[PDB]
Write a protein that binds this DNA or RNA. Structure first.
Length: 96
RNA sequence: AAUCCAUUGCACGGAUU
């Protein structure tokens, strides 16, 4: 699957250092992405399938787009962040 | 908790008398 480049309120981040625990990762992600707009939530799972990944849900698509373009490749816990838009809407967004 | 193995994965595993 080619990188998902169609704008979405949610950015999908992968290539994250898997040693960072869930609480610290969410807190560090919030601290860094909050300069782009209002974050609705950050979904992190350390399961086999979902580890090394995170979903940052912005209240506005414009915030997600700026976040993606700006933070693409940022060296984080010694690995360049890889960012795409989520393929589908987050449920929080989908109810709104 | 820690170390190790395996995992690059689009959601809402495994090992350490």
């Amino acid at each position: 699957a080619v990188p998902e480049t169609r704008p979405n309120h949610t950015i999908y981040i992968n290539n994250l250092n898997e040693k960072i625990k869930k609480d610290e990762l969410k807190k560090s992600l919030h601290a860094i992405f909050s300069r782009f707009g209002q974050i609705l939530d950050i979904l992190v799972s350390r399961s086999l399938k979902m580890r090394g990944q995170a979903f940052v849900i912005f209240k506005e698509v414009s915030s997600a787009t700026n976040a993606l373009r700006s933070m693409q490749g940022f060296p984080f816990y010694d690995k360049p962040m890889r960012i795409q838009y989520a393929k589908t809407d987050s449920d929080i967004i989908a109810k709104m």
